[PDB]
């Protein structure tokens, strides 16, 4: 009768899908609640400077 392309006929999936994705890269930047300069400046008076 004729020939046919593979795409011409509907296909049903015989396969089970498992969609595992990867974990992304991350960057930890330097984070500080108070710098040591801020802690030193917290004092009311400094003997050295006075």
């Amino acid at each position: 009768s004729h020939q046919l392309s593979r795409a011409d006929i509907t296909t049903v999936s015989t396969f089970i899908d498992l969609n595992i994705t990867m974990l992304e890269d991350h960057e930890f930047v330097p984070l500080e609640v108070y710098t040591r300069h801020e802690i030193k400046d917290s004092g009311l008076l400094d003997y050295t400077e006075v």
Binding site: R6, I9, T10, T11, V12, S13, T14, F15
Partner: peptide, 10 residues
């Protein structure tokens, strides 16, 4: 009337 085929391997 309706023809179907299995998928080829990925």
């Amino acid at each position: 009337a309706t023809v179907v085929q299995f998928e080829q391997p990925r």
